[PDB]
Amino acid sequence: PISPIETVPVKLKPGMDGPKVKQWPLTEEKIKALVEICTEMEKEGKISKIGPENPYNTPVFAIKKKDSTKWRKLVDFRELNKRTQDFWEVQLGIPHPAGLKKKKSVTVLDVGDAYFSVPLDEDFRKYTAFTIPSINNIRYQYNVLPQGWKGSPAIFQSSMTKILEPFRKQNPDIVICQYMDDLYVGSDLEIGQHRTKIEELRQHLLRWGLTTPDKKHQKEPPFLWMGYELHPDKWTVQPIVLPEKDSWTVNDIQKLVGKLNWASQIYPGIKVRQLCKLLRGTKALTEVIPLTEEAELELAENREILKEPVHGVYYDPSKDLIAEIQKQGQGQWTYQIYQEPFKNLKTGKYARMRGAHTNDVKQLTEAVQKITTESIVIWGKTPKFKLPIQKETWETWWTEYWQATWIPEWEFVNTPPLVKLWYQLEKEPIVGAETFYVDGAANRETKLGKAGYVTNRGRQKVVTLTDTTNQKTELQAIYLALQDSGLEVNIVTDSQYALGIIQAQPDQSESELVNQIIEQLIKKEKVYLAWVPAHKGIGGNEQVDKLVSA
Amino acid sequence: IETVPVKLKPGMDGPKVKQWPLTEEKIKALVEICTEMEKEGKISKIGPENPYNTPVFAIKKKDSTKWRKLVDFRELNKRTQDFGIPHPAGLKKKKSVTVLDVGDAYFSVPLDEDFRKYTAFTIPSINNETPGIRYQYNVLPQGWKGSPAIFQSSMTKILEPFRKQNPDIVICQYMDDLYVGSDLEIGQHRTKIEELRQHLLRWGGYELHPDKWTVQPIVLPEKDSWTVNDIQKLVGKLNWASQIYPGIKVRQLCKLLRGTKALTEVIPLTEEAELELAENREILKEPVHGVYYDPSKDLIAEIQKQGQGQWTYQIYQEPFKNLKTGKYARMRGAHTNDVKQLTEAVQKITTESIVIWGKTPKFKLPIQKETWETWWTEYWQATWIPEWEFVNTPPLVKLWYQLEK
Ligand SMILES: Cc1ccnc2c1NC(=O)c1cccnc1N2C1CC1
């Protein structure tokens, strides 16, 4: 079954030459076999003997495939693959289960060794040369796509799309999806009708040397789709097995946390905090670790979660898309996309490493965005959103934030906890509030600093700092101010980072100190923050500022 | 026709840019659009043996509810050899200018066989249920820099008559568009324009107002009485501003600010401070001297969001030596979404840069990459695509321009 299809022109990378590697020596039985096997496809026209006019060579091997005490062959194109041009995209990204519309029925045709049905570019064939040695010290080359060579998949995919354009056209109410050597076909016809067509298709591929496993020997639903179990009217989350064991090695924990993390997507509730703690300091990937009781209760509670299997539904184009979001903790969000309430299409969660300085709204914002993207990738469209935030809140925040931001049509859902603004700086000074002129300075090299303040009420403080830095000093100045102020405060500072907070008003940060201030900001009733150019006369920057520079 | 050979700047290789996900709605439109151009033999299906790719997408101009296909050749233009096309300085002054979409023209002209591979692009498939759909151009593509180039000859011809019979009218072509400027009152301009269309059709509001784009001065507040705060705010701004006008002085004012007083405390101005201030207001009445466009350097465009629907910008080549600056108020209807406002803004500004220096500025956008990548196209309406980078607006450069008159 070679095929009568136009070969795709293939050439070697810019200015390189074919493979030239030596052939390993072989046992009497590793040569005997390969002679047989090769004489086989030799007769099938798949490979053709070559003379000495071919200077290339690839190492052929022989490994007896398991569950058959018979011999099989293997050719090592590592080198050839390094020398072969690149092709576009053998996989623009995988179709997710939630992006499929349901079907009355779905077959799958293993187009298996169709890799060998497609003839290789006559010109290129010469680089595929390999050698079968003899006992005490026989050449060939491929005439069809070799298994394991860079361009096969690619060449075979396109080949396939061509050969499918006709049948697809005639039968538009039918749906084929291809992937690898697996051809999935589904539809909404009546089983007998479906049956007929599949056969029709089969005899079509069958026409291009493309042998396919008959009805008598093909696969049947459910279908294990990398992670999922697929029925034509519902998919399932193929229950995950946590190895209950005696002693745990570091490596084991990692793998475990790995599978656990994967799970948290569909199973929010899953936790790995204490389990992660078990790695701190680990000296060897195989050193065994004592499972803290906290880690026990956790590992445990996780098995319970993974008990309940999870089935979902498919895409129904005649219904709107809804995306609902929840905040599980600081910078942790869960979302579920569905068409009919509680009938979920997809779910997920996100952990946001605080990074420099953020705030929940900003983070809420990023979630939406991420969701929006994957939605489009799947349903070529974006969901209407149900968000745990009030229009008032959102409005206040965005019209004022310094960065461009946006949230597609959405609707407030009162599912607590809601995301809110933890504090807001006053737009102008507070009348009848103490005014703290803060300043901080530190010796860059010796890391010795002082921080402090003086108010218009005559109050003052100063503090000496060991092993500190400038930024810290400045911030500290501000921390103190806040600590000693009271519900309403006015604070002038010449800090560049103060400018930061003002413009962003973050409610989370990597810097503990910042967090400190943030906590203090939140406590205050009314706070107004002001910045003035450093080292200028601006009193305050002259008095508390003078006390801290030498 | 006989085709001119186009090549890549030496050393370069074709573009291999990934396709961005597209909505169902626009993927459909592109298919239609492509099957058609295919028949029309403008484009042809390609195999995987071709590894180059450029992003594609669809948009709709105003007063057009018919989808239009747009490609992102930036990368390819960057890699396409240069050749030399002349820019006036007249429309810069015209009383009015009108832009014209002559992208079509190109589809008549064929493209050198060997450069075609480089023009490969891909229509994706929703959820990847199908493999993508690869095409490649056979004629001059719209949006490519080589196209207005190769179609130069024919173009000049086609126009000369309208040219010679109207040397009082300016015509500048920048890629897919044609800029027509005349001081003739609107009546004659509009009519003369339509006459020009016909002149072209023959072969096979909306108005612009150049002049009027005068840079604005930085006005300073005025109060009956000033507070510690007011001053501090003022002084802060002046201080920073001195980087532009070095004659600005702040000491007399900073003197009043000595002593730890309350922000709300009122302070009367010394006659010395009064002067220092009056003297500053003067210097600010006009743009800094010495700023002259340099054709050999990149034009830069910075945008600050001011909130309330307002945005400010500055075109320059060297920080603080602005060539142009300005304010922009949100178009009627974008009352809830930033991204819409920003693209509109981006487009208007690019426009001016073209009209003026006949060159697209590189943008410095106050928006997170992801946000921008996800939605800019949704509101884009120009055949060209400028360069951009994403940044963090310093708080000061913002308070400054907020002060523009
Ligand atoms: C794994 C896979 C990838 C893409 N599409 C499908 C499948 N397999 C199915 O079993 C399936 C299930 C439900 C709907 N379409 C399906 N099919 C469609 C092709 C008939």
What gap in Å lies between CA B241 and CA B235, rounded to an integer? 10
- Alpha-carbon distance A265 to A286, whole Å? 28
CB A104 within 8 A of CB A177: no
Q: How far apart are the first and last CA of chain B?
A: 56
| A49 strand-pairing partners | A140
After which residues does chain B have a break in its backbone, defined as C to next N over 2.5 Å?
83, 204
Residue window 301-360, chain A: list those with CB within 8 Å of chain B.
none
Which residues, 6+ apart, have CB-to-CB distance to B10 below 8 Å?
Answer: none
- The residue among A370, A387, A422 that closes a domain is A422
Question: What is the SS3 assignment for B177?
Answer: strand
In a 3-state reduction of DSSP, which class is residue A370? helix
Best of A230, A236, A314 to mutate for ligand 1, by most ligand atoms within 8 A of CB?
A230
Q: Give the integer Cα–Cα distance in Å for A12 and A273.
A: 50
* 3 state DSSP class of A161: helix
Strand partners, A318: none
Residue A472: other Cβ atoms inside 10 A:
20
Q: How many Å apart are CA A325 and CA A366, to the nearest integer?
A: 12
B229:A429 CB<8 A: yes
Distance from CA of A415 to the nearest CA of B (A): 24
Tell me whether A499 touches chain B (CB under 8 Å). Answer: yes
Annotated binding site of A: 110, 181-182, 439, 474, 494, 545
Query: Measured between alpha carbons, how far is B269 from B276 in angstroms, rounded to an integer?
Result: 10
Is the shortest distance between the CB of A401 and ligand 1 below 6 Å? Answer: no
**Same domain for A500 and A427:** yes
Instruction: Find out whether B205 and B190 touch, Cβ atoms under 8 Å.
Output: no
Q: Which of B97, B106, B103 is nearest to B177 (CA)?
A: B103
E strand or H helix that includes residue A177? strand A174-179
> Same domain for A494 and A514?
yes
Walk me through the domains of chain B, giving residue ranges and CATH numbers: 1-86+107-147 (3.10.10.10), 90-106+148-179 (3.30.70.270), 180-293 (3.30.70.270), 294-400 (3.30.70.270)
Provide the token pair at B395: 């708080």
**Can you tell me the distance from the alpha carbon of A169 to that of A165, in angstroms, rounded to the nearest whole number?**
6
- Farthest-apart Cα atoms in chain A, separation: 103
**A3 has a chain B CB within 8 A of its CB:** no
- Cα separations in angstroms, A132 against A50, A64, A127, A147, B178: 12, 17, 16, 18, 68
Report the candidate in A107, A104, A114 with the shortest Cα–Cα distance to residue A216.
A107
What CATH number corresponds to the domain at position A437? 3.30.420.10
- B147 burial (CB, 10 Å; 0-12 / 13-18 / 19+) is buried
**Which residues of A are less than 8 Å from B239 in CB distance?**
533, 536
| Separation CA A533–CA A519 (nearest Å) | 27
Residue of A294, A353, A305 whose CA lies nearest to A329: A353
User: Measured between alpha carbons, how far is A90 from B241 in angstroms, rounded to an integer?
Assistant: 56
| Residues of A in Cβ contact (< 8 Å) with B263 | 429, 435, 490, 492, 528, 530
CA distance B260 to B271: 22
Mutate to test the interface with B, among A406, A430, A499, A501 (most CBs of B within 10 A): A406
Mind spelling out the 3-state secondary structure of A399-424? HHCCCECCCCCEEECCCCCCCCCCCC
Q: Which residue of B has its CA nearest to A175?
A: B129
Q: Is B223 helix (H, G, I), strand (E, B) or coil?
A: coil
**Among candidates B48, B44, B19, B45, which has minimal Cα distance to B126?**
B19
Give the closest of B250, B257, B264 to A431, CB-based. Answer: B264
Q: How far does the centroid of ligand 1 lie from the alpha carbon of residue A106, in Å?
A: 7
SS3 of residue A94 by DSSP? coil
Tell how far the Cα of A185 is from the centroid of ligand 1, in angstroms. Answer: 7
Q: Is A171 on the interface with B (CB under 8 A)?
A: no
Q: How far is residue A76's CA from residue A22's CA, in Å, rounded to a whole number?
A: 11
As a whole number of angstroms, the distance between CA B257 and CA A533 comes to: 12
Residues A252 and A335 in one domain: no
Are A331 and A395 contained in the same domain? yes
Contact A114, A181 (CB under 8 A): yes
Residue A413 near residue A508 (C-beta atoms within 8 A): no
- In chain A, what is the straight-line distance between the N-terminal and C-terminal CA atoms, in Å? 89
User: Does ligand 1 have an atom closer than 6 angstroms to the CB of A378?
Assistant: no
Question: Do B345 and B313 contact (CB within 8 A), yes or no?
Answer: yes
Q: Does the beta-carbon distance from A92 to B339 stay under 8 Å?
A: no
- The amino acid sitting at A49 is K
The answer to whether B339 touches B367, Cβ cutoff 8 Å, is yes
Domain count, chain A: 5
Same domain, A146 and A41: yes
Residues 6+ apart with CB under 8 A from B2: none
Q: Based on the fold, state whether residues A120 and A203 are members of the same structural domain.
A: no
- Asked if A501 contacts A528 with a C-beta cutoff of 8 angstroms, the reply is no
Residues in chain B: 405
Residue B242 to residue A346: CA distance in whole angstroms: 56
Per DSSP, the three-state class of A508 is: strand
Largest CA-CA distance found in chain B, in angstroms, rounded? 82
Choose the residue to mutate in A96, A101, A102, A106 for probing ligand 1, maximizing ligand atoms within 8 Å of C-beta.
A106
Return the closest-CA partner of residue B316 out of B373, B256, B361: B361
Residue A75 in tokens: 């050719």
Question: Pairing state of beta strands A130-131 and A105-110?
Answer: unpaired
Please answer whether residues A308 and A265 qualify as being in contact, where contact means their C-beta atoms are separated by less than 8 angstroms.
Answer: no
Domain housing A408: 316-422
Subunit contact B239:A533, Cβ cutoff 8 A: yes
Number of A/B CB contacts below 8 angstroms equals: 188
Centre of ligand 1 from the C-alpha of residue A226, in Å: 12
Quick one: A79 and A8 in the same domain?
yes
Asked whether B74 and B385 are in contact (CB, 8 A), the reply is: yes
Last residue of a domain, one of A221, A255, A275: A221
Span from the CA of A100 to the centroid of ligand 1 (angstroms): 7
Q: Which spans in A44-148 are helix H?
A: 78-83
Give the distance (Å) from ligand 1 centre to CA of residue A178: 9
**CATH assignment of the domain containing A99:** 3.30.70.270
Same domain, A105 and A190: yes
Instruction: Find all residues with CB under 8 Å of A544, minimum gap 6, and list them.
Output: A437, A438, A439, A452, A453, A454, A460, A462, A477, B260
Q: Among A85, A92, A541, A542, which would you mutate to test the B interface (most chain B Cβ atoms within 10 Å of its Cβ)?
A: A92
Q: How many other C-beta atoms lie within 10 A of the C-beta of residue A269?
A: 13
Pick the last residue of a domain from A177, A194, A221: A221
Give A97's DSSP letter: G
Q: Chain B closest CA to A432's CA: distance in Å? A: 8
Looking at the complex, report in whole angstroms how far the Cα of residue B228 sits from the nearest Cα belonging to chain A: 10
Q: Mutation test of ligand 1: which of A92, A100, A176, A189 has the most ligand atoms closer than 8 Å to its C-beta?
A: A100
Q: Is the CB of A449 under 6 A from ligand 1?
A: no
Phi, psi values for residue B388, rounded to 5°: -150, 160
How many CB atoms sit inside 10 A of residue B296's CB?
Answer: 6
Indicate the DSSP class of residue A70: S
Q: Which of B56, B337, B135, B30 is nearest to A368 (CA)?
A: B337
* Alpha-carbon span B68 to B385, nearest angstrom: 15
Whether A380 sits inside 8 A of B126 (CB atoms) is yes
Which pair of structure tokens corresponds to residue A348? 């997920």
Could you tell me which of B3, B295, B331 has the C-alpha nearest to residue B139? B3
Chain centroid offset of residue A147 CA: 29
Q: What is the DSSP string of B104-123?
A: GGGGGSB--GGGGGGG-EEE
Distance CA A381, CA A389 (A): 23
Q: Is A147 in CB contact (< 8 Å) with chain B?
A: no
Chain interruptions in chain A, by residue before each (C–N > 2.5 Å): 137
The span from the CA of A231 to the CA of B175, in Å, is 53
Experiment used for this model: X-ray
Using DSSP's 3-state secondary structure scheme, residue A71 falls into: coil
Q: Is B183 marked as binding a ligand?
A: no
Cα separation, B288 vs B318, whole angstroms? 13
Cβ contacts of B372 on chain A, cutoff 8 Å: 404
A321 and A412 part of one domain: yes
User: Which H helix or E strand runs over A344?
Assistant: strand A343-351
Question: Which contiguous run of DSSP H or E holds residue B35?
Answer: helix B24-39
In a shared domain, residues A365 and A510: no
Q: Domain check: are A124 and A263 in the same one?
A: no
